[PDB]
Structure formats: C-alpha cells, structure tokens
Design a protein around this ligand. Structure first.
Ligand SMILES: CC(=O)N[C@@H]1[C@@H](O)[C@H](O)[C@@H](CO)O[C@H]1O
Ligand SMILES: CC(=O)N[C@@H]1[C@@H](O)[C@H](O)[C@@H](CO)O[C@H]1O
Ligand SMILES: CC(=O)N[C@@H]1[C@@H](O)[C@H](O)[C@@H](CO)O[C@H]1O
Lengths: 193, 193, 193
C-alpha cells in the first residue's frame, strides 16, 4: 500500500507515522492533541449566573467567559443589575483552588461545537502554588434599554484565600443600574498537557 | 508493518486508528476536525468597508474582525470617519440571517495562513431560529492624526427576528470626526461542527 | 486490515489517508498543521519588562501578551509605572523587523502546555513590506493599590524605523502614577504557513 501525507512510511523499520508540525500539534499519552488548544469556561447558553452584591439585597445576572489562549486567560463578563444604585457593588466569583470549579454558580467547559466538554477547569487557575497579585480598573459605560447612563469604571482583583481563587469585581455607579460589559487578561502557569 | 503513536494498530480486529484527545479533536462526517477551532470573518487586508451614517452625507472607512472561539464572537471595529460632527452617528452592519454573509460590504473567512477559506460564515450568527435583541455601550476615544479629540461612547445593538442579522453601532461625538477603535463580545448558539 | 475514521483506504490506488476538514486543519511540507493556530508572544511569567519614559527618570514594569488568531493580533499590556506625573509618558517597544524578536526586553513564544516553543515570532509583524501607520487611542483607568485615580487615555502607534517594528504607547496622566492595563487589535499580513 501507499501512505498519503501527512501519513508517512519508514522503510527502514516498516513503521507508519503521522507527520505533524510540533509547535501546533503534539502527542500526549499516545494520542494526538494541540499545543495551544482553545478552552472556554463559561456560563451556559441562556443560563446567566445569579450574583449578589455582598450582604445587600441587590442581585444581578452575569454571563461569563474565561478563554484560554496559550497560557493567557481572556476574562469577559456581562452584568445586568436589577437595582438602580449609587455606590460601589462587589461582584465576587470563587473557584476551587485545585480543580478550578466555579463555587459561585454554574459554569462549564464548552466546545465550539456548542457541546459541554468533560474537562476539569484547572486551566483558569493563575498558579499551582496558590498565590497571585493582579489588580486594575477598566473603563465601563452603564446603560439601560439602549440609553446612555454613565461613563464610569469597574475594578478587578485576583487573589487566593483559604486555598481558593477569587476574581473580585467592583463597579461604581451613580443613580443607575450596573449594566455593563468588561473584559481583561491575566496569565496562567498551569499547563494544558 | 508497525504504527507509531498517535496511530494505533489493533491486531484483535486488524484495524488501524488515530488516537486523539476528544476535548480538543473530533470527527466530523468521517474527517478530523477541532473541538474549538478559531475562525475569523473580516474585511480583507487593506480593503476597509465603506459605511454611511444613515441618510446623512457622512461616511467612514471600517476594518472589521469577528473572531470566533468556542461559542463566543469577539467583534472588533476600526472606524475612520471623515466628517467633523456633533451628534450621534449610526453605523449599521447587515448579515444574511441564515448564512451570515455580510451584505453591507465585502468580508471573508480568513485562515491563519493568510488565505481565504471556503466556509459559510454562520458562526457569527447569534441564533438560527430564536429572535434576539441585545444592546450595550463601550467607552471610546476619538482621535485624529495621533492627537486626542474626545473621550466618549459607542453603543452596540444585535437585532434578529428571522430575517437578516443586524449589528447597529451608534457613536456620539462633539465637534470631532468619529475615528475610534471598539470591541465587544457576544455569544453564538451556532455550533461549529 | 480495516481503517477507522478519520483514516480511510482508497481501494483503487492502494493508498491510506488521513481525512481532515480543510478549513480547520491542513498539510504543509507533508506535515499536519492547523489552519488558524493560536500563537502567543509574551513576557515570561513573573518576568516583566523594564521600560523608561523616553529620556525622563521615570520607569515602569510591563507584562505584555501578543495573541495571534487567524491573521489578527490582540496586544495586551499591563503597565505599572513608578513615578507620579502630570503629562504624557512615552513607552516604546522595539521588535526586529525581519524576525519579530523583541529588542527592548525578553519575550518568548509560549504554548498552551506552558513550554516555550522554538518558533520565530514573525507572526506579530504587521506588514511584510515595512510600511504601516496604524494609530489610535484607548480609554484607560489609572489606579494604585486597588484605589481609583483617573479616567484617561493612552495612544498606540505601529510604525517602522530603520528597518525595525515599533509599538509606541503614550499614556496621559494628571497627578497619578501611570498604572493601567490596555488592549488593542491589529492585523498581520504575515501568513503562518
Ligand atoms: C440602591 C443603592 O444606592 N445601593 C448602593 C449599593 O449598590 C452599593 O454597593 C453601596 C455601597 O457603595 O451603596 C448603596 O447606596
Ligand atoms: C455635521 C454634523 O454635525 N452631523 C451630525 C451627524 O453626525 C449626526 O449623525 C446627526 C444626528 O445626531 O446630527 C448631525 O448634525
Ligand atoms: C514628574 C512628571 O510630571 N513628569 C512628566 C512626564 O511623566 C511626562 O512624560 C512629561 C511630558 O508630558 O511631562 C513631565 O511633566
């Protein structure tokens, strides 16, 4: 028989092989995998996460995507608060510091096929040694039903406590509902192998 | 003959197979594919789209990239307006509601190779058979020739009711040209299979 | 013997093949590769680059990621300035115009596995023929130790000078340290082949 590329036949030892570009593809436990696969940990379709502003009776819906490109994580959140507010709201997400599972609400690893993947979400975790400093602010615009309300900001802060990973967001509003989209990037040293 | 990993020969049923990591690779109609491929639907290299501000005699050039990963679309637009304006401009993009093809201007599915891909861009559509309306605002900075002009805002709006798919952007300016970059994210329930 | 999908045997030319979806995977030089692979050029984990505000005695630490998907680059920077300032600071990154290698400080092509890849970072270069003038502004928020300081802006400019590729960023502050994260997107006409 013949082998068409990318299959090749080594006459020197009667071996059929798959040739692949190693920076892009790899072998892991005898199976073909990607060097830099895209993995997304997200809230499901039509299932936003319910969040509470600390101890207040102020709630919001949040759609969340955490996207792994190489070793970077792109974090996106879309928040729809139900209370008009003047102050700073704290929207806190907790994740198991070993497995990555979201403790705050329902998230899942989702393929581009639209199907849930049976994958433990360690890939969102910054460090295997459970320490991290990262904080900053992003500019945001709050609106409601297509109407501009306020140009303001939202902080983000990555921490560990009690061995779990926290992403704490804080939005500042003046007489408007916290309804906004914000994203930022961070780095993971957890390898996908 | 022999097989080297990730290929595998089964002497039991005399079958040669490819072993692959299922959360990263898959089979689609007998062919190897990715579980989470990156696709980009964009204006061609150095071929910005012409956009008209409603019925006004006011135009802009636009470079657009719509980057699909997992089930998320990252929309990025580079708008270069030509008329100094005070008011709100409306930039409307229209896409075929079934195929995703841009009707407002020329866009192509572009691989990392730099080659156009022969792919129907259904992966930018938010849904196939569910009416959709989603709006938000992002902060922007208008500039001209490297010089700051105004910190302001642009709304985005996704509309669909089983005709065409619309992305409607509204920039608000005060005595400057609408010249800005802006991105936002949205979900597509169209699986890539 | 039998072949299991995605392997197939053409009874006719006695050839065994790997079937694959061409918009997702491809063959280059007889080797399997991706059509739109993810590559990331970045500062090493916990090894920020040292930058200077032009000739002033004002410095910043910078974490940088340059994410290539399709032909688009997502540039992200986390700038941690050390000196309170009122004015506009200039932060300049310089890259070899042929190979893409960062000349300002150490950066590396990092796979999803957490391993450095042996690849030339040409995939960050905007134009093959060394003529480009992409510039714009992004809104940013300066903070310190998790406290808000200022809503402001930062320009970006992609140029070539003396055969090398420059990304020049200019942050404008009023009585605060230049401490912010910012991102922007641009197009690379260098195909990954
Ligand atoms: C209805 C209302 O104003 N609620 C806000 C609340 O959103 C914020 O978390 C808090 C502390 O800043 O201040 C309250 O006044
Ligand atoms: C020349 C000028 O200012 N044109 C603006 C236009 O850009 C805006 O779309 C419209 C409605 O707000 O108001 C017009 O007057
Ligand atoms: C200490 C201080 O204010 N330094 C700023 C400097 O950051 C800026 O690059 C320069 C040009 O605007 O102006 C100086 O006043």
């Amino acid at each position: 028989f013949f082998t068409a590329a990318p299959l090749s036949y080594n006459t020197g030892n009667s071996t059929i092989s798959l040739d692949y570009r190693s920076p892009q593809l790899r072998v892991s436990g005898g199976a073909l995998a990607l060097t830099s696969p895209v993995f997304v940990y997200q809230t499901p379709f039509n299932t936003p996460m319910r969040l509470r502003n600390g101890t207040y009776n102020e709630y919001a819906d949040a759609h969340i995507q955490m996207v792994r490109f190489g070793t970077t994580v792109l974090f996106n959140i879309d928040v729809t608060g139900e209370t008009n507010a003047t102050g700073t709201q704290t929207w806190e997400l907790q994740f198991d510091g070993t497995l990555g599972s979201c403790l705050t609400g329902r998230m899942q690893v989702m393929g581009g096929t639209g199907e849930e993947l049976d994958v433990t979400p360690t890939f969102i975790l910054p460090t295997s040694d459970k320490s991290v400093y990262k904080q900053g602010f992003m500019p945001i615009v709050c609106s409601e039903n297509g109407e501009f309300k306020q140009s303001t900001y939202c902080s983000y802060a990555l921490t560990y406590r009690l061995g779990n990973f926290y992403i704490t967001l804080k939005s500042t509003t003046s007489g408007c509902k916290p309804i906004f989209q914000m994203s930022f990037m961070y780095e993971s040293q957890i390898g996908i192998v």
